[PDB]
Amino acid sequence: LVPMVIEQTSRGERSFDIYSRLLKERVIFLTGQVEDHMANLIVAQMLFLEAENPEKDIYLYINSPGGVITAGMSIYDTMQFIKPDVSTICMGQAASMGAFLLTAGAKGKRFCLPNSRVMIHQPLGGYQGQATDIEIHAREILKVKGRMNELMALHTGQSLEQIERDTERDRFLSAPEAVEYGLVDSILTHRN
Amino acid sequence: LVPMVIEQTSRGERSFDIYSRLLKERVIFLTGQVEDHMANLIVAQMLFLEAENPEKDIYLYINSPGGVITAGMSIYDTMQFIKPDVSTICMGQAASMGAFLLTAGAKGKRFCLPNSRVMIHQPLGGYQGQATDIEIHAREILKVKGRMNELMALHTGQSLEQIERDTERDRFLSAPEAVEYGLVDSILTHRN
Amino acid sequence: LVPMVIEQTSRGERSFDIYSRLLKERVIFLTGQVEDHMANLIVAQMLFLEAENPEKDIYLYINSPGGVITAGMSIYDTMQFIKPDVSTICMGQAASMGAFLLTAGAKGKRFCLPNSRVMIHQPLGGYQGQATDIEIHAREILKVKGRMNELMALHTGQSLEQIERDTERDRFLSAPEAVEYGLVDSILTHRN
Amino acid sequence: LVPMVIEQTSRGERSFDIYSRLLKERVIFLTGQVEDHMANLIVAQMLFLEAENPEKDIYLYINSPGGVITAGMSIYDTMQFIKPDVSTICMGQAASMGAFLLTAGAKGKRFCLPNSRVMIHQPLGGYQGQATDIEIHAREILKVKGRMNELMALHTGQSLEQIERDTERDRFLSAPEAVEYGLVDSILTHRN
Amino acid sequence: LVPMVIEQTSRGERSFDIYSRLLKERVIFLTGQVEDHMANLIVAQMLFLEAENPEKDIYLYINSPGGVITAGMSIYDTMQFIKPDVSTICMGQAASMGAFLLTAGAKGKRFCLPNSRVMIHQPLGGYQGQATDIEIHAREILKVKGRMNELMALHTGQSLEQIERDTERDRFLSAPEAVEYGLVDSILTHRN
Amino acid sequence: LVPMVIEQTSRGERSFDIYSRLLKERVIFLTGQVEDHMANLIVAQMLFLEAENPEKDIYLYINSPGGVITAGMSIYDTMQFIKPDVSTICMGQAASMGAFLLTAGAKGKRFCLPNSRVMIHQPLGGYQGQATDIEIHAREILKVKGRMNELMALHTGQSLEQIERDTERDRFLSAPEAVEYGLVDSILTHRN
Amino acid sequence: LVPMVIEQTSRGERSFDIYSRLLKERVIFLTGQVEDHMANLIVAQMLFLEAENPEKDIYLYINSPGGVITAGMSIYDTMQFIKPDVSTICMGQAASMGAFLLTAGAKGKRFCLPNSRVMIHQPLGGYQGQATDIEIHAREILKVKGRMNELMALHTGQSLEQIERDTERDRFLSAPEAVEYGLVDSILTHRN
Amino acid sequence: LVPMVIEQTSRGERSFDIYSRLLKERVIFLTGQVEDHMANLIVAQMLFLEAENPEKDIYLYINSPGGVITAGMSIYDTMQFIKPDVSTICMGQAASMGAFLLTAGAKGKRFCLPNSRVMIHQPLGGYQGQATDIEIHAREILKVKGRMNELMALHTGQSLEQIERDTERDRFLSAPEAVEYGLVDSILTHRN
Amino acid sequence: LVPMVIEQTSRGERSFDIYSRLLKERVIFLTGQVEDHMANLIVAQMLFLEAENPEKDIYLYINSPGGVITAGMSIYDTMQFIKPDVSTICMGQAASMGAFLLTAGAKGKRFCLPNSRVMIHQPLGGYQGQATDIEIHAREILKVKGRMNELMALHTGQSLEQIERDTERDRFLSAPEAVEYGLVDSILTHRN
Amino acid sequence: LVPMVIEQTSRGERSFDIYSRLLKERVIFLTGQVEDHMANLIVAQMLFLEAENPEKDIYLYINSPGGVITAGMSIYDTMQFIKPDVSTICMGQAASMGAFLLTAGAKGKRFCLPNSRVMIHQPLGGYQGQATDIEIHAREILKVKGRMNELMALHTGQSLEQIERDTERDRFLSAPEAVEYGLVDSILTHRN
Incomplete structure (x- = not known):
C-alpha cells in the first residue's frame, strides 16, 4: 500500500502519493533489482525533472541488490x-549496479549513510550453446567488464589496474571505506 | 481492504485512508518482514514528515517478525x-530488526505495550560457492554482527560484552524486562 | 508503481502519469519483449500522435531484449x-527486433547512448509436425529472414551480402560500432 | 499499462485511454487469440459505433495468431x-481466424501492411469419448470446415475447389500475395 | 481491458463502459461458462431493467459453451x-445451457446469427461415495434431465419423446436447422 | 525383505522364503488392498493347493483394509x-471386502483373533458423465450392493433386512461381537 | 511377492513360481489393463502351449477392466x-476388451463364475488435430466398432443389429445374464 | 512378470523365459515404442540367430505404434x-515405423493376422533455433521422407507417386487391404 | 528384460545374455547418450577383449545421438x-560424439549401413558465473573444439580448415556421402 | 546392463561381471560423482587387493567430475x-577431487590418456544460519582448502604458493600440460 499525502498550495489542496510527492521535490527512488521496466521508469522521471528545471539538482536514493547491466x-x-547534477544517496546497501550508479553521481554530491554497505564485483553472466x-x-x-572498470576508475579516481584487482571478487565497503576509496564524497550522519 | 475515513476541516471534507489519515498525524506503521520496498516506503514517509514540521516528534509503531538487515x-x-525525534512504540512483537529499530528511537521516547514481546539475536545469513x-x-x-552489537549497546546502554553474550542465541524479553534491559524507556498501560 | 506528475497549464492543473506525460511530448517507450499487446499499444500511440501533429517528429526510446517478429x-x-519522422533512441540495449526498429527510424535521427549495446541476429523459430x-x-x-536482411541493408546502407554474413550469428555492436556500421546516426553524450 | 490521452474539445478537456480515444474515431483493435470474452467485447464496440453513426466506416485492425472459431x-x-462498412487492416500477422475476418471486410476496404503476413489453414479440433x-x-x-471454405471463396473470389486445396495445409501469404489471392484489396505503404 | 465510451446527453457528458453503455440500452451479455457469480450478475441486470421500464423488451446476447445447470x-x-419480453440472440455458439436459455426467450423474439452454432445434450454430472x-x-x-426436456419441448414446440431422443447425445444445429427445430424464430443476416 | 528358511525334507534340504514355506502347508496370506493382481495371485495359490490335496483344509489369513469388489x-x-474347505482367520483389520471374504469360509472354520476389528459397509463407487x-x-x-447383502446373510445367518440396515453405514464389530453377529465362528486365544 | 512352489516329477523336485506352475497345465492369466506388452506375453504363452501339445485345450482366466483394442x-x-481350443473363464469382471476375449473362446468351453460381472461397450478413442x-x-x-460388433455377434450368436443397440452404451451383464446373451456357455459353481 | 518354461531334452532339463524360449526357435518380438535401446536388443538377437544358423529364416512379430526413425x-x-530371410508377422497393429519393418521382410514371408491395423504416414519431426x-x-x-518412400515402394511394389500421395497423411489399412497394397503377402487366419 | 541364450561346448551347457553372448564374438554395442558410466563399461569391455586376443579385431556398433565429450x-x-583394430559400424545414426567414434576406427574397417545418418557439429557447452x-x-x-577438429581431420583425411567449416553448424551425411567425406570407407549392404 | 564374462581356469570355467573380472587383475574403477557410498566400495576393493598381494600394484581408473571432499x-x-603402490590412470576427465586422487598415486605410476582434461579448483561449500x-x-x-593445497603441492612437487594461485579459480590442463605441472608422470598413447 502507498500512503496518500496532501500538498497545501495557494491554488488549493492536491492529493499526492508518497513517491509522487517526493518526485515533485526532485527525488527519485531506485529500489529493488535493476530491470528494464524499473530502469525505464527512472529514465522518464529524470527527463521530466530536467524539463521542469534543468538547473536544480536531482536526488537519487539507491537501495538495491543490483540487477541487469543494460538496464x-x-x-x-x-x-x-x-x-x-544527479546527487546519489546510498541507503541500506549498494550492489555492483547500485554502486556503479552511486559513484556515477555528480562529483562532490555522492553521499552514503553511516551504516550503508557497498558491494562491487565483476559482471555476471553465462550462455549455453555451440562453442562459436x-x-x-x-x-x-x-x-562489458572492461567498460565498467574504466567508468568506475573515472568516477572513483582509482587506477584501472586497482579497480580490476578489487572487482575480481565481491568486495564489501562501509561508508568510511567508500569515502577513502573514492566511491562516494561524504557521509550524512545528522541534519545541520 | 483498507477502510476510508473522512477529515472534517474548515476547508471542507477530505477522503483519507486509515493509514494515510494517521500519517497526517505523524504516525508511521512498520508491519511485516523488513524488506527493501517496505523499508524504502517508510524512509519516504519520514522525509515527508520532516519537511512538513521538523520540530514535531514522529511516531513509529513496530510490529514485525524482522527481516533484511540492509533494509x-x-x-x-x-x-x-x-x-x-522518532518515538518507537512496540505492538505485538519486535524481532531482531524490529527490536533494533525499537531501541534506535529517541532516548526517553521508546515505549512498549505491556503484553508486547521483544526478541534479539545475532544476524542470520549464508553463502554457497568457493572457499575464497x-x-x-x-x-x-x-x-555486520559487530556493528549491530555496538549500536545496540549505545542505545541500550549495556556493555558491548553483555550484548554479545545475550545475542549469541535468541533472547525473549517482555515489556518489564525490556525496560530493565534498557531496550525501551517505559510502558503504555492506560491513557492518562 | 507509476508516479503521478502535474502539468501547469493556463487552463489549470492536470494530473498525468509519468508515461502519459511524456506521451504528450511525442515520446513513446518500447520496453520489454516485443509482443502483440505491447506492440499494438505502440501502434495506437503513433497514430494518435500523427493526428495531433503530423509535422512534429516522434521519439521512440528502445530498451528491449527483442521479441516476436510479427509484432x-x-x-x-x-x-x-x-x-x-520517428526518431529512435537506444537506451541500455537493442536486440534483433529492437535493433531492427532502431535502424528503421528516420535517416539522420537515429541515436544511441554511449554505453548502449546493440545485438543483431537471424530470426529464431521452430515447428513440430509432419515433414510436409x-x-x-x-x-x-x-x-522472413531474407526480408529482414533486405530492410536492414536498406536502412543501414550495407550490402545485402554483408548483412547476411553478420547476421548468421549474434553480433554485438557498441555505440561507436553502430555508427560506423550505419545502424545509427550519432551518439548522445551530453545535452548541448 | 495503458497511457492516458487528453482530447481538446470546445466543451472542455476529457481524459481518455489510448484504446478508448481511438474507439471514438471508429477504430477497433483485435489483438491476441480470438476467444469469447475478447470477441464479445469487439461485438459491443461495433454495435455502439453503428448507433453513433451508421454511415461512417469502421476500422478494425487485425493482429492475432487466431483462436476459437465460434468466437x-x-x-x-x-x-x-x-x-x-468494416474496413479491416492487417498489422503484423493474420492467422486462420484473423485472415478470415480480414477478408470478411467490405470489398475494396481491406488493407494489409507491406510487411504483414497472412496464414490460412483448415479448422483444428478434437474429441475424446465413445465412437458414436x-x-x-x-x-x-x-x-464448419466446409462453411469456412465457402465464406472464404465468397470474399476472396476464388473457386471453392481452390480454397480447399490451399487450406489443406498451412499456407503463408505476404501482402503482395494476398492482393493477388483476393484476400485483401491494396497495401498501405505510405500516407498520401 | 474494457474501453470507455461517452454519452452526449442534454444534461451533459457521461463516462460509460462498453458493457455498461449497452446495459443502458436494455442489452445483456451472457459470455463464458454459466456459473453462479456470472448468472447472479445477469439476474441483477434483468431486475434493474424491469424497474426502469417493465414494458420495453430486454435483449440477451448468448455466446457461451454452457455451464452449471442450477445457475x-x-x-x-x-x-x-x-x-x-427477453429477446435472446445467439452469437458464435450456444451449448446445452446456452441453447436452453436461447429457446427460453419470448416467442417470436428468439434470433440467431447465420453462422452461429447450437448444441443440445443431456445433463452432465457425477458423484463418488456410498451406493445409497x-x-x-x-x-x-x-x-433435472426430465425437467429440462419438458421445458425444451414447451418452448421448442416439439414432442417430449422427440426431445429425449435428440438429447441423448450431443446434437449440433446450425441457424437454419434451429429455426426448423423450433429452437429459434428467425435469423439476422443484415439490418433492414 | 522376506527371510529365507530351510526345510529338512526327506532326500534333501531346500531353502524357501517365509511365504512360500507357509504355502506348502496350505496357508495363504491376504494382506493389503484387494486388487486384480493380488486377487489373481491368491486364486492361483488356492487352485494349486487343491491339486496337491483336494481334501485337506485350506487357511486364508485376512488382514486387508478392503479393496475392489470385482477383485x-x-x-x-x-x-x-x-x-x-477354506478356513478364514482375521488378524488385525477386516474391512467390507476383507470381512466379506472372512464370512465366506466354511461353516465352523471361520476364526478371529481376540484383538481384531471387523468393519462392514455398503459398496463404495462413483461415476461421472451423461445422465444416461x-x-x-x-x-x-x-x-452389487444387493448381491453382497444376500451373500452376507447366507453366510452370517442374519436376515436380509438386518444386513441391509446394519450395512448402511460403517459397522465396527470386535472379535466377540463378530461371533454373535455370525461373521466368524470362534475366537483363537491360546493353543489347546 | 510371487510364491514359489515345488513340483514332483520323475526327474526329481523342481521349483516353480505360482504363475509358471499353472502355465504347465495350459493355464494363462489375463489380469489388469490390456496393453501391447502384456498382450505379447499372452501370445507367447499360447504359441508355446500349442507346440508342447496341439491337441490339449488351453485355459485363459480373464479378469481385467479393458484396454487397447489393438493389443x-x-x-x-x-x-x-x-x-x-481356448477355454475362457471370467473371474471378478470382464470389461469390453475382456468380454470380447471371453466370448472369443471355443464354443461350449466358455465359463463364468457365479458372481462375475461382464460389461460390453463400444470402442473409445480420440484425436486432436486438423479436420482432414x-x-x-x-x-x-x-x-473398428463395426468389425468389433460383427465378431461379437458371430461368437455370441445374436443379430448384428441387436449387438449395436446393446453396445451403444455401457451394459453390465451378470453371470446368468451372460449365458442368455451368448457371451458364456455355462456357469461354474462347484467342482464335481 | 515373464513366466518361466522348462524344455525337456534327452541331455537333461533346462529352464527358459517365455521370450527366451521362443528366441531359440528364431522368433523375435517387437513390442512397444521403437527406440534405440529396444532396437539394439532386436539387432543383437538377429546377429545371434545368424551366427547360430545362417540358413534358417527368422520370424519377427511386429506390434508397436511406431517410434524413432533412426532406431x-x-x-x-x-x-x-x-x-x-527375416519373416515379419503383424499382430495387433503396425504403425509407420512398424509398417515399414513389416513390409521390409523377405518377399513371400510377410504375414498379417486377419484383425490387424496398419498405418503408414510421412516422418514426424521438429526443431527450434536459428533460421539457418x-x-x-x-x-x-x-x-528421410523421400528415402523411406523409395524403400516402401520397392518392397510394396507401388509407384513412387502413389506412395507419396498415400503417405501424405495417416492411412489406415486392414489386413485384406495390406495384401493388395503390397505391404504383406498373405493373411494367416488358421493353422493347416 | 533381456533374452537368454545357451552356448554348447565340451564343458557343457552355458547360459548367457544376448549382449554377453555377443561379447565373446568381440562385439560391443554403443547405444544411448554417451556418459561416463556407459563409457567406462565400453572401456572395460575393450580392455577385456584385448587380453583374450590382442590380435583379433573388435566390432563396435555405434547407434547414439552423441553425449558428453569427456566420456x-x-x-x-x-x-x-x-x-x-576396432571396427566401427554405424547403424541408425551417429551424432557428433557418435560420429567421432565411428571415424576413429581402424582404416578400412569403418563401416556404415545403407540407411544411416551421420551428424557432425561443434561441441556444445555452457557456463554461468563471473566474467573471469x-x-x-x-x-x-x-x-576442445580445436582438438576435436584436428582428430577428425586426421581420421577423415580432410584438411583442418575443411573440417572447421563443415562442423561450424550441424551437417547431416548419408552412408554414401560419409564415404566420400572420409568418416567411413565402405557400406555393408549384404553379407558376403 | 553390466555384461558377464567367463574366465578360463584349470579347475573350470567361472562367470564374473565385467567389473568383477577386472577387479581380480587389481583394477578399480572410479566413475561418477564422488560420494560416501561409492567411496567405500573403492576403499573396500583397495583393502581387499592389499591382502591378496601386498606387493603387486593396484590400478585405479579415474573418470569423474569430482565430488565430496570427505568421501x-x-x-x-x-x-x-x-x-x-596405487597407479592412477585418467580417462576422459579428472575434476578437483578426481585430479587430487589422480596426482595422489605412486611416483612414476600416474598416467593419463592423450585426450583427457584435468581440472583443479579450490573447495566449494556453503552454510546458512547464525553468524556464529x-x-x-x-x-x-x-x-580444508589449505590442507588440500599442501597435499597437492607435495604430490605435484610445486611450491604451495603456486598451487594456491593456480587453484584460486578453475584451471583446465591437458595431458601434456599435466605432465609439466606434475599431476601425472607420463602419457599412454599406444601399447608397446
Whole structure:
C-alpha cells in the first residue's frame, strides 16, 4: 500500500502519493533489482525533472541488490546526459549496479549513510550453446567488464589496474571505506 | 481492504485512508518482514514528515517478525538523520530488526505495550560457492554482527560484552524486562 | 508503481502519469519483449500522435531484449506509414527486433547512448509436425529472414551480402560500432 | 499499462485511454487469440459505433495468431449485419481466424501492411469419448470446415475447389500475395 | 481491458463502459461458462431493467459453451418472471445451457446469427461415495434431465419423446436447422 | 525383505522364503488392498493347493483394509468352488471386502483373533458423465450392493433386512461381537 | 511377492513360481489393463502351449477392466489361429476388451463364475488435430466398432443389429445374464 | 512378470523365459515404442540367430505404434544385411515405423493376422533455433521422407507417386487391404 | 528384460545374455547418450577383449545421438591404445560424439549401413558465473573444439580448415556421402 | 546392463561381471560423482587387493567430475596407507577431487590418456544460519582448502604458493600440460 499525502498550495489542496510527492521535490527512488521496466521508469522521471528545471539538482536514493547491466547503463547514460547534477544517496546497501550508479553521481554530491554497505564485483553472466556462440558471448561480457572498470576508475579516481584487482571478487565497503576509496564524497550522519 | 475515513476541516471534507489519515498525524506503521520496498516506503514517509514540521516528534509503531538487515539500516540511518525525534512504540512483537529499530528511537521516547514481546539475536545469513568467496561473505556478516552489537549497546546502554553474550542465541524479553534491559524507556498501560 | 506528475497549464492543473506525460511530448517507450499487446499499444500511440501533429517528429526510446517478429513488423510498418519522422533512441540495449526498429527510424535521427549495446541476429523459430508442415514453416521463416536482411541493408546502407554474413550469428555492436556500421546516426553524450 | 490521452474539445478537456480515444474515431483493435470474452467485447464496440453513426466506416485492425472459431463467427456475423462498412487492416500477422475476418471486410476496404503476413489453414479440433460421440463431433468440424471454405471463396473470389486445396495445409501469404489471392484489396505503404 | 465510451446527453457528458453503455440500452451479455457469480450478475441486470421500464423488451446476447445447470435455472426463472419480453440472440455458439436459455426467450423474439452454432445434450454430472448416496444423486440428475426436456419441448414446440431422443447425445444445429427445430424464430443476416 | 528358511525334507534340504514355506502347508496370506493382481495371485495359490490335496483344509489369513469388489469376488467364487474347505482367520483389520471374504469360509472354520476389528459397509463407487451413463452405473452399483447383502446373510445367518440396515453405514464389530453377529465362528486365544 | 512352489516329477523336485506352475497345465492369466506388452506375453504363452501339445485345450482366466483394442486383437487372432481350443473363464469382471476375449473362446468351453460381472461397450478413442486428419481417425474408429460388433455377434450368436443397440452404451451383464446373451456357455459353481 | 518354461531334452532339463524360449526357435518380438535401446536388443538377437544358423529364416512379430526413425532403420538395415530371410508377422497393429519393418521382410514371408491395423504416414519431426539451423534439419527430414518412400515402394511394389500421395497423411489399412497394397503377402487366419 | 541364450561346448551347457553372448564374438554395442558410466563399461569391455586376443579385431556398433565429450574421449583413447583394430559400424545414426567414434576406427574397417545418418557439429557447452570464470570455460571449450577438429581431420583425411567449416553448424551425411567425406570407407549392404 | 564374462581356469570355467573380472587383475574403477557410498566400495576393493598381494600394484581408473571432499579423502588415506603402490590412470576427465586422487598415486605410476582434461579448483561449500555458525563453517572450509593445497603441492612437487594461485579459480590442463605441472608422470598413447 502507498500512503496518500496532501500538498497545501495557494491554488488549493492536491492529493499526492508518497513517491509522487517526493518526485515533485526532485527525488527519485531506485529500489529493488535493476530491470528494464524499473530502469525505464527512472529514465522518464529524470527527463521530466530536467524539463521542469534543468538547473536544480536531482536526488537519487539507491537501495538495491543490483540487477541487469543494460538496464543500469540506460540510467547511467541518462544521468550523464541531463544537465542537472544527479546527487546519489546510498541507503541500506549498494550492489555492483547500485554502486556503479552511486559513484556515477555528480562529483562532490555522492553521499552514503553511516551504516550503508557497498558491494562491487565483476559482471555476471553465462550462455549455453555451440562453442562459436559461447566465444561471442564470452567476448561481449568481457568487453562489458572492461567498460565498467574504466567508468568506475573515472568516477572513483582509482587506477584501472586497482579497480580490476578489487572487482575480481565481491568486495564489501562501509561508508568510511567508500569515502577513502573514492566511491562516494561524504557521509550524512545528522541534519545541520 | 483498507477502510476510508473522512477529515472534517474548515476547508471542507477530505477522503483519507486509515493509514494515510494517521500519517497526517505523524504516525508511521512498520508491519511485516523488513524488506527493501517496505523499508524504502517508510524512509519516504519520514522525509515527508520532516519537511512538513521538523520540530514535531514522529511516531513509529513496530510490529514485525524482522527481516533484511540492509533494509533496516536505511530506516535506522534515516531516523538518526532527521531532526524530529522518532518515538518507537512496540505492538505485538519486535524481532531482531524490529527490536533494533525499537531501541534506535529517541532516548526517553521508546515505549512498549505491556503484553508486547521483544526478541534479539545475532544476524542470520549464508553463502554457497568457493572457499575464497565464503571467507569474504563470512567476514562481511561478522562485521555486520559487530556493528549491530555496538549500536545496540549505545542505545541500550549495556556493555558491548553483555550484548554479545545475550545475542549469541535468541533472547525473549517482555515489556518489564525490556525496560530493565534498557531496550525501551517505559510502558503504555492506560491513557492518562 | 507509476508516479503521478502535474502539468501547469493556463487552463489549470492536470494530473498525468509519468508515461502519459511524456506521451504528450511525442515520446513513446518500447520496453520489454516485443509482443502483440505491447506492440499494438505502440501502434495506437503513433497514430494518435500523427493526428495531433503530423509535422512534429516522434521519439521512440528502445530498451528491449527483442521479441516476436510479427509484432515488430507492425511497429516498423506504422513508422514508415505515418508522415512524422520517428526518431529512435537506444537506451541500455537493442536486440534483433529492437535493433531492427532502431535502424528503421528516420535517416539522420537515429541515436544511441554511449554505453548502449546493440545485438543483431537471424530470426529464431521452430515447428513440430509432419515433414510436409516442417517444409512449409521452414520456407516461411527463411523468407522472413531474407526480408529482414533486405530492410536492414536498406536502412543501414550495407550490402545485402554483408548483412547476411553478420547476421548468421549474434553480433554485438557498441555505440561507436553502430555508427560506423550505419545502424545509427550519432551518439548522445551530453545535452548541448 | 495503458497511457492516458487528453482530447481538446470546445466543451472542455476529457481524459481518455489510448484504446478508448481511438474507439471514438471508429477504430477497433483485435489483438491476441480470438476467444469469447475478447470477441464479445469487439461485438459491443461495433454495435455502439453503428448507433453513433451508421454511415461512417469502421476500422478494425487485425493482429492475432487466431483462436476459437465460434468466437470469430460472432465477429464475422456482426460485421455483415451492421450497415457501416468494416474496413479491416492487417498489422503484423493474420492467422486462420484473423485472415478470415480480414477478408470478411467490405470489398475494396481491406488493407494489409507491406510487411504483414497472412496464414490460412483448415479448422483444428478434437474429441475424446465413445465412437458414436466421435462421429458426431467429426461431422460437426467437417461442416464448419466446409462453411469456412465457402465464406472464404465468397470474399476472396476464388473457386471453392481452390480454397480447399490451399487450406489443406498451412499456407503463408505476404501482402503482395494476398492482393493477388483476393484476400485483401491494396497495401498501405505510405500516407498520401 | 474494457474501453470507455461517452454519452452526449442534454444534461451533459457521461463516462460509460462498453458493457455498461449497452446495459443502458436494455442489452445483456451472457459470455463464458454459466456459473453462479456470472448468472447472479445477469439476474441483477434483468431486475434493474424491469424497474426502469417493465414494458420495453430486454435483449440477451448468448455466446457461451454452457455451464452449471442450477445457475442457468436462476436466469431462466428470472426471464419468465419479469414482465418484459427477453429477446435472446445467439452469437458464435450456444451449448446445452446456452441453447436452453436461447429457446427460453419470448416467442417470436428468439434470433440467431447465420453462422452461429447450437448444441443440445443431456445433463452432465457425477458423484463418488456410498451406493445409497449414488442412488440419491442419480435420481436427482435424472429429474433435472426430465425437467429440462419438458421445458425444451414447451418452448421448442416439439414432442417430449422427440426431445429425449435428440438429447441423448450431443446434437449440433446450425441457424437454419434451429429455426426448423423450433429452437429459434428467425435469423439476422443484415439490418433492414 | 522376506527371510529365507530351510526345510529338512526327506532326500534333501531346500531353502524357501517365509511365504512360500507357509504355502506348502496350505496357508495363504491376504494382506493389503484387494486388487486384480493380488486377487489373481491368491486364486492361483488356492487352485494349486487343491491339486496337491483336494481334501485337506485350506487357511486364508485376512488382514486387508478392503479393496475392489470385482477383485475380491474372484476369490470368493474360488473359495466356494474348490472342494477343499477354506478356513478364514482375521488378524488385525477386516474391512467390507476383507470381512466379506472372512464370512465366506466354511461353516465352523471361520476364526478371529481376540484383538481384531471387523468393519462392514455398503459398496463404495462413483461415476461421472451423461445422465444416461449415471443411471447405468447407478443401477449396477445398487445390484452389487444387493448381491453382497444376500451373500452376507447366507453366510452370517442374519436376515436380509438386518444386513441391509446394519450395512448402511460403517459397522465396527470386535472379535466377540463378530461371533454373535455370525461373521466368524470362534475366537483363537491360546493353543489347546 | 510371487510364491514359489515345488513340483514332483520323475526327474526329481523342481521349483516353480505360482504363475509358471499353472502355465504347465495350459493355464494363462489375463489380469489388469490390456496393453501391447502384456498382450505379447499372452501370445507367447499360447504359441508355446500349442507346440508342447496341439491337441490339449488351453485355459485363459480373464479378469481385467479393458484396454487397447489393438493389443486385445493380437490375443484374439492368436486364439483363433492356434488349432487347440481356448477355454475362457471370467473371474471378478470382464470389461469390453475382456468380454470380447471371453466370448472369443471355443464354443461350449466358455465359463463364468457365479458372481462375475461382464460389461460390453463400444470402442473409445480420440484425436486432436486438423479436420482432414481427424476425419481419417474418426472414420477408422467406426470401422473398428463395426468389425468389433460383427465378431461379437458371430461368437455370441445374436443379430448384428441387436449387438449395436446393446453396445451403444455401457451394459453390465451378470453371470446368468451372460449365458442368455451368448457371451458364456455355462456357469461354474462347484467342482464335481 | 515373464513366466518361466522348462524344455525337456534327452541331455537333461533346462529352464527358459517365455521370450527366451521362443528366441531359440528364431522368433523375435517387437513390442512397444521403437527406440534405440529396444532396437539394439532386436539387432543383437538377429546377429545371434545368424551366427547360430545362417540358413534358417527368422520370424519377427511386429506390434508397436511406431517410434524413432533412426532406431527403426537400424533394424531394417540389419534385416537386409544378414543373409537369413527375416519373416515379419503383424499382430495387433503396425504403425509407420512398424509398417515399414513389416513390409521390409523377405518377399513371400510377410504375414498379417486377419484383425490387424496398419498405418503408414510421412516422418514426424521438429526443431527450434536459428533460421539457418531450421533449413538444415528441414532438408534432412525431407530427405528421410523421400528415402523411406523409395524403400516402401520397392518392397510394396507401388509407384513412387502413389506412395507419396498415400503417405501424405495417416492411412489406415486392414489386413485384406495390406495384401493388395503390397505391404504383406498373405493373411494367416488358421493353422493347416 | 533381456533374452537368454545357451552356448554348447565340451564343458557343457552355458547360459548367457544376448549382449554377453555377443561379447565373446568381440562385439560391443554403443547405444544411448554417451556418459561416463556407459563409457567406462565400453572401456572395460575393450580392455577385456584385448587380453583374450590382442590380435583379433573388435566390432563396435555405434547407434547414439552423441553425449558428453569427456566420456567419448575415454573410448577414443582406449581404442587407439589397445593393439587390436576396432571396427566401427554405424547403424541408425551417429551424432557428433557418435560420429567421432565411428571415424576413429581402424582404416578400412569403418563401416556404415545403407540407411544411416551421420551428424557432425561443434561441441556444445555452457557456463554461468563471473566474467573471469566464463573466459576460462569459454577458452577451454574452444580448445576442445580445436582438438576435436584436428582428430577428425586426421581420421577423415580432410584438411583442418575443411573440417572447421563443415562442423561450424550441424551437417547431416548419408552412408554414401560419409564415404566420400572420409568418416567411413565402405557400406555393408549384404553379407558376403 | 553390466555384461558377464567367463574366465578360463584349470579347475573350470567361472562367470564374473565385467567389473568383477577386472577387479581380480587389481583394477578399480572410479566413475561418477564422488560420494560416501561409492567411496567405500573403492576403499573396500583397495583393502581387499592389499591382502591378496601386498606387493603387486593396484590400478585405479579415474573418470569423474569430482565430488565430496570427505568421501575422496577416505580414498586418498587408504591409498597412502596400503603398502601396494596405487597407479592412477585418467580417462576422459579428472575434476578437483578426481585430479587430487589422480596426482595422489605412486611416483612414476600416474598416467593419463592423450585426450583427457584435468581440472583443479579450490573447495566449494556453503552454510546458512547464525553468524556464529558461519564463522565456524567458514574457517573449516578454509582449513580444508589449505590442507588440500599442501597435499597437492607435495604430490605435484610445486611450491604451495603456486598451487594456491593456480587453484584460486578453475584451471583446465591437458595431458601434456599435466605432465609439466606434475599431476601425472607420463602419457599412454599406444601399447608397446
